[PDB]
């Protein structure tokens, strides 16, 4: 995935005109005017606005801490033009995220008219989507929390078409997320936050658990209610706490659904190219599931197939139910938190599938789970074993593994301090290189080649793994033309010469092949070759009963002399012999 375009800056544009209700507002009892978990009435018209803005910033920093922050509170016209221009100047080629709230603004028109003014509501100021597109002509992501949000998307597309037609005398670069369709309004529900769509996109948990408590017709866990849900301990990233485990499961499920629903052409673009885009779409699927129950249909561009019907959501509810049954006692008594069996069962199902896999079958649905399991230190050995067994099938099995992104993770596992992982990483890399030798020198740019040299050096490792290691080294030496120096720095020649006497036919063949491949166009190991009289040992393999070994010996010996002769000098003695 060479296309690594990233988001650089985020613009937060708020129109939360606290204390002012547009004339088309229906009020008030169930209004539930809770925004970013803040009730503005308890603080007043100025403190509340700044506090809400601060929380919105915090909610976004949780997903991309490195983003450049930019914020406007009730900007009018020049304020927005200047903001967009400054952000474009900050990064002209990268993506910009534009988040428009609109809660304090009358329902949008076909032009996007907004209630921004110098503290006098009679100055509605009509705006133009076309002009906004002009200011931000870079690749960009738009988020709309408007009631008739779909209307904006439709106008946006029509204006983009208009511009293209004018240019015949941005459409393909923009991504849009709209809260709901142009013909429906956001729900007025006394128990939900007003900014429901934002909450779903920015705080996937919280509302997910609140909804669980409210939506369930008959609760199956007596004693668990919101008073405890809001007291669940732990950091979102602390993998060993309740919330940590829940976030891990949530991520695994939403990735599995995306993998098993979308075409690969969209999957790679939306869930791999950019960390923020992938996070937003991952949460979008939840927003769709929740908002469906209130007669709202979130709208996005590009359009995705519906997913609320997928079976995996049942697994989520089960996992949530199990967690929550322990919450009371942990709070009341302090009992240790027990981990769920979720990943163990998913691995078991994968293992069952492996019983008899063929090309003429649907691929396993759980590869995105194995990818997640490999990130921890609990079930890593089992996931690596099962992955190996999967990869042992014909080349098609490897291609699927490549398409999900095993590669960049096994490159990291290659340099761990563990030793017990040796035969697994060797097997996996032997199969990957056997199928895909085009890897752009990743094993020789980093220190991975050193690992395999040490693996070869280990005198107690079984011959099967020594053979695979020799194969790997031969491949990277002939394949990359940068490992040519590294194989000499580690004295690979000395190791191969010592190993020429190994009784196993394949170690004899691959060691001879490694030596032949080393002595190609090296000046340093032209001299090292002649210096150590390496040929003196290789010709003894010409006596080997097995013709495959004799062929390997003839190859290595002929190559040795053919290249050593470039000097001639005293080595002409060798050349003739």
């Amino acid at each position: 995935m060479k296309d690594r375009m990233k988001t650089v800056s985020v613009a937060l544009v708020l129109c939360l005109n606290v204390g002012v209700d547009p004339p088309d507002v229906v009020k008030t009892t169930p209004c539930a005017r809770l925004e970013c978990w803040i009730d503005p009435l308890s603080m007043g018209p100025q403190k509340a606005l700044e506090t809400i803005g601060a929380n919105l910033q915090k909610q976004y920093e949780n997903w991309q801490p490195r983003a450049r922050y930019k914020q406007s509170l009730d900007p009018t016209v020049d304020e927005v033009k200047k903001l967009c221009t400054s952000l474009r100047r900050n990064a002209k080629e990268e993506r910009v995220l534009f988040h428009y709230n609109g809660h304090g603004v009358p329902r949008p028109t076909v032009n996007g008219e907004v209630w921004v003014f110098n503290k006098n509501y009679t100055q509605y100021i009509p705006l133009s989507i076309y002009d906004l597109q002009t200011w931000m002509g870079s690749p960009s992501i738009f988020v709309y929390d408007c009631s008739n949000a779909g209307l904006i998307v439709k106008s946006f597309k029509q204006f983009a078409l208009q511009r293209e037609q004018e240019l015949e005398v941005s459409m393909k670069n923009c991504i849009q997320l709209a809260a709901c369709e142009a013909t429906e309004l956001l729900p007025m529900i006394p128990d939900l936050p007003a900014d429901l769509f934002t909450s779903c996109l920015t705080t996937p948990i919280k509302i997910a658990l609140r909804w669980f408590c409210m939506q369930k017709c008959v609760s199956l866990v007596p004693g668990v209610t919101l008073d405890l849900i809001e007291k669940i301990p732990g950091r979102l990233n602390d993998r060993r706490t309740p919330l940590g485990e829940l976030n891990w499961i949530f991520t695994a499920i939403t990735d599995t659904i995306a993998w098993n629903v979308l075409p690969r052409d969209l999957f790679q673009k939306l869930f791999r190219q950019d960390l923020l885009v992938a996070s937003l779409f991952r949460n979008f699927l939840l927003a769709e599931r929740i908002m469906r129950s209130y007669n709202c249909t979130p709208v996005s561009s590009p359009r995705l197939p519906p997913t609320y019907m997928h079976a995996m959501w049942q697994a989520w509810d089960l996992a949530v139910d199990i967690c929550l049954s322990q919450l009371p006692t942990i709070i009341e008594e302090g009992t240790a938190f027990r981990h769920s069996p979720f990943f163990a069962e998913q691995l078991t199902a994968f293992q069952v599938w492996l019983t008899m896999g063929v090309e003429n079958r649907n691929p396993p649905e759980q590869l995105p789970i194995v990818l997640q399991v490999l990130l921890s230190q609990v079930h890593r050995l089992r996931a690596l074993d099962l992955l190996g067994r999967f990869l042992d099938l014909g080349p098609w099995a490897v291609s699927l593994a490549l398409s999900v992104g095993i590669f960049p993770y096994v490159l990291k596992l290659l340099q761990s301090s563990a030793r017990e992982l040796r035969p697994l990483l060797v097997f996996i890399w032997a199969k990957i290189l056997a199928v895909d030798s085009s890897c752009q020198a990743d094993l020789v740019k980093d220190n991975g080649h050193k690992y395999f040299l040490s693996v070869l050096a280990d005198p107690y490792m079984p011959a099967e793994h020594r053979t695979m290691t020799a194969f790997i080294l031969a491949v990277i030496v002939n394949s990359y033309h940068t490992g040519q120096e590294a194989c000499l720095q580690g004295n690979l020649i000395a190791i191969c010469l010592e190993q020429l006497n190994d009784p196993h036919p394949l170690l004899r063949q691959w060691v001879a092949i490694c030596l032949g491949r080393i002595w190609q166009n090296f000046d340093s190991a032209r001299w090292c070759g002649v210096r150590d009289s390496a040929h003196e040992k290789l010709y003894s393999l010409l006596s080997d009963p097995i013709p495959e070994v004799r062929c390997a010996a003839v190859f290595a010996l002929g190559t040795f002399v053919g290249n050593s002769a470039e000097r001639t000098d005293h080595s002409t003695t060798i050349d003739h012999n």
Binding site: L275, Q372, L375, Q377, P408, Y409, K412, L413, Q415, S416
Partner: peptide, 8 residues
């Protein structure tokens, strides 16, 4: 680098 953290 990686989209997800690894406990190396």
């Amino acid at each position: 680098e990686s989209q997800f953290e690894m406990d190396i």
